[PDB]
Symmetry: C3
Subunit: 328 residues, 3 copies
């Protein structure tokens, strides 16, 4: 049935946010979002629905829609409309900007796909980043219709007392970090995301956890305030980068594992940098550092035979990628 096929496409799209392609993973992600906030989940699901539908509308590639490569940007768009809204939860007028920007996502996903086709690089979350930055800059904190949360630059020296760091909460920053990929902050939605990643590919889960831990640790090395690390606002740019470089767009080897860790460090430090730069505009560093760091690590040309950049036409999940590479 066409309706069932479209629903399958929309679940897969949700999943593609943590680099997974599995309807069960998508349904678990939706369950976790319902655990966090029903309003956020409704906005995100509507966003991915509109993104996929307009992907079909503008005669896009059927395989890309069927694999969810046109619905992962929309779900994030809806979620961070619902996160960076000052009007409070269940503000139904916020759905209209979700409509417009979700329809706008595939246009960017195709234009940037044409730009990044020469060098064979994925668009990543760049269509989303552009769309949500456009929204949060066009509106800002001072609308009468769709205001946003006020983000301000640091103007005083932070007070960090290292003798009162909560190590248990610091370790809790790992599951919370895997859940800020969607902007959620509940530890249990993070655990649900871990399970959803594991049911598809265990190596994706391992890289996500190690990247979140590594983004935490990189945040502690520049005296980032403890409140953020606990929420994960430090961890997420690192999870996506680690999953990207570990086994998704390379072949998994120990050299590539170390390169993924290095990309996680670069993503964390670039997260701090872009969070301090984009804050003057009133904008958050919403998955820009992941995009830039993982693009600059995927463009790396090295003579090491172990670091092999897989063609984009043969990327499903790290285990299948590894088997494909040893087969050839």
């Amino acid at each position: 049935s066409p309706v069932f096929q479209f629903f399958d496409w929309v679940l897969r799209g949700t999943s593609q946010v943590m680099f997974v392609n599995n309807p069960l993973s998508g349904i678990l992600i939706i369950l976790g979002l319902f655990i966090q906030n029903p309003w956020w989940a409704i906005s995100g699901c509507l966003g991915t629905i509109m993104s996929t539908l307009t992907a079909l509308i503008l005669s896009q590639d059927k395989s890309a829609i069927a694999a969810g490569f046109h619905g992962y940007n929309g779900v994030l768009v809806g979620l961070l409309m619902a996160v960076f809204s000052d009007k409070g939860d269940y503000y139904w007028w916020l759905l209209l900007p979700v409509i417009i920007m979700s329809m706008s996502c595939p246009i960017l996903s195709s234009a940037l796909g044409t730009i990044f086709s020469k060098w064979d690089l994925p668009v990543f979350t760049l269509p989303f980043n552009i769309t949500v930055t456009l929204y949060l800059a066009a509106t800002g904190h001072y609308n009468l219709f769709f205001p946003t949360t006020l983000l301000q630059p640091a103007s005083a020296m932070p007070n960090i007392t290292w003798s009162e760091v909560q190590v248990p909460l610091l370790l809790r920053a790992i599951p919370v970090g895997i859940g800020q990929v969607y902007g959620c902050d509940n530890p249990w939605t993070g655990g649900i995301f871990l399970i959803a990643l594991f049911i598809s590919s265990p190596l994706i889960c391992l890289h996500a956890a190690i990247g979140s831990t590594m983004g935490m640790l990189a945040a502690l090395t520049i005296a980032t305030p403890f409140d953020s690390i606990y929420f994960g606002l430090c961890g997420f740019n690192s999870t996506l980068a680690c999953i990207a470089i570990g086994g998704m767009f390379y072949v998994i080897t120990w050299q590539t594992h170390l390169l993924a860790i290095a990309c996680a460090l670069f993503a964390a430090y670039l997260g701090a940098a872009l969070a301090n730069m984009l804050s003057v505009f009133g904008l958050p560093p919403c998955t820009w550092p992941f995009c830039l760091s993982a693009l600059t690590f995927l463009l790396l040309t090295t003579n090491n035979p172990a670091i092999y950049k897989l063609p984009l036409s043969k990327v499903t999940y790290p285990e299948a990628n590894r088997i494909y590479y040893l087969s050839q």
Copy 2:
């Protein structure tokens, strides 16, 4: 006569600002600029003269100069030197920065032409945007020689009373929007621009009017203050985008008409976004949103046979483009 040939080249250049190639259209545009401000028109005409002359100087392509593709950036440069100047009208020292930056325009127009040659995209107004942003950032509001008008970010919630909107002035925002392509604000110079566009291609006029109206309407959907919409500071990024996607760089079809309308919406919202971001630097969103939106709509790859991206070597005006396409 070489002098007459150069004058013909300079008139055509002026016209190329609203996507038209006709000396009569150029002379009508110059007449409209004289209606608005003799000082602004003098600065802009000198800017396009220098841009064309330095295009000949740096051994650029003869056809591009003869068709005005090297004088449209300069005229805008001169005009927005004369608009964003705090020293008042008839400040003769402002001509020297016009000299320098107009000479700088073709260099960018060729460099970005080489960058955008692989994907077959026009440079658009990017050489101008870079040049005028460079000027207005290098000087700013606090020089002793060439100060600029102070642009500040929003710091208070605007007071919009929808019961006192001037609908007649709101509809007047359409001709005013077609005149802010040159930075002018007189309704009658807008009407002169409409006539100049119509004498060449009626479809360009239709797309310009519909894009200005659409940029207006998109501005009203984010509670943009009424004073700006009336001036058109909302309308212009949409006119150029609509003319671009309607019949200039595509073949005119109903699908392409709807895509041009969508590009107009994207240009308007990106205009709001970049006007709120670039304001912190003290810079205006001078035709950046048109460039970005129309590039991201011209890079779109779709399977729909009706959306055909014309080769850049066969783009004159939408009617000729349509006849060329049906001929082949």
Copy 3:
């Protein structure tokens, strides 16, 4: 001996900052840095050591390492860690960020090398600019570990009294300008840099001096405060641009000499522009204008046979380049 080979590679790397490839030039540059500040020189030398070492680590090209194209970014990174540090000289904890960012430089140098390979353009200092901007934005002035010097935008009209300009100091801005390529401010380290450039290629020295003078003069045309020009914060973006366009990446001709002067003007004005824009973030215009101006002048396509863009595989120094061109 491998140790001697690595030391030779590291000296050459230092030199490549002023577009020179000569171990004697490198040792003279290190001597000049020791004249300026032993702490800055230690940080910069450690930075280039780490950059070269990680270039070998990530299986990069042997010829590029042996010619120093992977150590020039690191030395600048270390130097401007030591310049933009608020903790004072001999703050040993600053070495760790130097480690991390110097290791990060070759990754960007390879990624951007792959991007700029299609159009045959050099990466320039872009890997460095990205790395140091990332550092100075991630930390800023308000850390507890690695604070930076506070940079603020202009908020009042500067008071310039042209009747009390120090012409001798103004002329001293030329050697000081050739020394701000490394962030040093001593006139004598500038003279040592002049000698180091001359021992390799006199034409590099001539272009550097003329570019520094031209950046000075371009700074005086926009009422730049006299204190900066004396330090050279105006001169350096122009020296590198002039050396780039004169004889390094083109064949030296009078037309190309004038084009190099024009690139110096563009670099100076873009230096002012980016110094006023990036200041709101708290960031300096650390060799961004040189990169952008010289890229936009190296992408220029002109019909003039005298302006010949040399293939990147045959660029050693302007005299050898000229002899190579006349040979073919």
